[PDB]
Symmetry: C2
Subunit: 157 residues, 2 copies
Amino acid sequence: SAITSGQELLSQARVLAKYLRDQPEGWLAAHRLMKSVRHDTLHQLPPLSADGRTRIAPPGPDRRASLKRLYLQQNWLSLLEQCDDMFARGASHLWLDLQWYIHQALLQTGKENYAAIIQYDLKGLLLRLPGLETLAFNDGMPFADDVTLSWIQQQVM
Amino acid sequence: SAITSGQELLSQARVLAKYLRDQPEGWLAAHRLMKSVRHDTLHQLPPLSADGRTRIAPPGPDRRASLKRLYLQQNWLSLLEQCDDMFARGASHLWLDLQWYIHQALLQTGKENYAAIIQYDLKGLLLRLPGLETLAFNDGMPFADDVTLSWIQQQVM
């Protein structure tokens, strides 16, 4: 709960973000608080890269199939809410596709100004950690697939 | 400490940010956590605007003269540390000049990638609240002066 146990900072930040989400139109605040506590804490290029793959475990087939279902079902509000839980429960969530899912849901929900911020937030992270966009997980699953990497290199820069 | 007392969220966020700042190279994380908890919580154009001036009180001559001294003394590291305390103890800190001070210190400290993020962060806020850049406090003191507003309209957009 102090100095060591960064794990405990993440859990204390989670309860702080839970508060903000419950408040009127406080999604962004709640969302962006996790982005700063997870992305702005990573200053190392790789963590570590083995023979191609990073030692970082993929998101999990259960939860990643659950998001494809919500996208197909065009249920933006639930997809948006489920992406945040996924970002909190994983590996700094370098599953960059999650950001694309949020972006798509924000465009389809009409919140265009919010969707622009998401792009800027990601641009900043990738400015700091260059090769991050192009890396892959344990199983070989990329952090960013064809559809999302396309969006990164020509829409977010 | 829950639902009501957003004041108590700010104090709990402050202790969370204090942790991050103490960690190696965790300034940004600490900084950006305050930006999300203070700026991303404001969705209203003005709060409220009277006959020109907003009902929002200025930063305080004591602390704003203290920052000019540090800028003149070119003590970037202390200015950067003092701007964060100022952002936490004030009115959502719409004292936009604070962001310019941080930006200048980040450029002079060499952390160019960090300084770019600061600009993007501000761009997002001003995208959400348009007229914010051009408003003024109780005494008539603008949120952004000539030197900083110049930086906003042609460097941050």
